[PDB]
Amino acid sequence: MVSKGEELFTGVVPILVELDGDVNGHKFSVSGEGEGDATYGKLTLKFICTTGKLPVPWPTLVTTLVQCFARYPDHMKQHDFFKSAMPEGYVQERTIFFKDDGNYKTRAEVKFEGDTLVNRIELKGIDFKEDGNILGHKLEYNYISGNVYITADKQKNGIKANFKIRHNIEDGGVQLADHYQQNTPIGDGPVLLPDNHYLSTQSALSKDPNEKRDHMVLLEFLTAAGITL
């Protein structure tokens, strides 16, 4: 295989996620667990708001809450930066601009801790409208999809990405979330720097009928594309 880190993803890998957030002074924490199967680009994850009631909509946190689980086609294996950075991992940083509203800034470390892939995140949101679609909880709970457009950042030995998410508004249009992303390796080893390509990503959100805590079940597929065979 073309990276050493790729070999860590040939089977089902356990995942843990931990997020601490503060949006307009509304603090919260989220814990998640599940597993990923990069052979199929498939993630199954369950998240709990460990602080009680989540003060923002769950859909707005999906993208923050492990792109190393993407399925890369055989002809694109040399473009998978994410797995190439493993096991030492990478820092993933975003600004997420919610059109006509506030923004999230996120910093995450994604790395193996033993046999488990762990995503640990800090999130800060500012300038939200207390009666906007976010703090007003006006968003639908169902699905998100989009293309993550990736480019190499050779000077940081990493990558950049950008994408736009449409969050359906209940009885309305959509709330746009414009994402800007950077990823840099934690370790000093060589990584794969990709040609331009994208991750086609689909997220399905549901509830566990036996779970009384504020929570989200996520089934997600992520597939690399955009380089022809």
Swiss-Prot record:
One of its GO terms (biological process) is generation of precursor metabolites and energy. Changing residue 160 to Q: In R10-3; matures to the red-emitting state with excitation and emission maxima at 555 and 585 nm, respectively. Changing residue 66 to N: In R10-3; matures to the red-emitting state with excitation and emission maxima at 555 and 585 nm, respectively. Changing residue 145 to P: Increases fluorescence at warmer temperatures such as 37 degrees Celsius. Changing residue 126 to V: In EBFP2.0; shifts the excitation and emission spectra to shorter wavelengths and increases quantum yields compared to BFP. Changing residue 31 to R: In mut1.28; shifts fluorescence lifetime from 3.03 to 2.76 ns. In mut2.2; shifts fluorescence lifetime from 3.03 to 1.94 ns. In mut3.3; shifts fluorescence lifetime from 3.03 to 1.88 ns. Changing residue 200 to F: In H9; increases fluorescence at 395 nm excitation. Photocytes. The keyword tRNA processing does not apply. InterPro entries: GFP, GFP-related, Green_fluorescent_prot. Changing residue 201 to I: Suppresses the 475 nm excitation peak, leaving only the shorter wavelength peak at 399 nm. In H9; increases fluorescence at 395 nm excitation. Keywords: Chromophore, Luminescence, Photoprotein. Changing residue 101 to E: In mut1.27; shifts fluorescence lifetime from 3.03 to 2.85 ns. Green fluorescent protein has been engineered to produce a vast number of variously colored mutants, fusion proteins, and biosensors. Further generation of mutants led to more stable proteins (at 37 degrees Celsius for example) with brighter fluorescence and longer fluorescence lifetimes. Gene3D superfamilies: Green fluorescent protein (2.40.155.10). Changing residue 103 to T: In EBFP1.2; shifts the excitation and emission spectra to shorter wavelengths and increases quantum yields compared to BFP. Changing residue 169 to L: In R10-3; matures to the red-emitting state with excitation and emission maxima at 555 and 585 nm, respectively. Contains a chromophore consisting of modified amino acid residues. Maturation of the chromophore requires nothing other than molecular oxygen. Energy-transfer acceptor. Its role is to transduce the blue chemiluminescence of the protein aequorin into green fluorescent light by energy transfer. Fluoresces in vivo upon receiving energy from the Ca(2+)-activated photoprotein aequorin. Belongs to the GFP family. Monomer. This is Green fluorescent protein. The lineage of its organism: Eukaryota, Metazoa, Cnidaria, Hydrozoa, Hydroidolina.
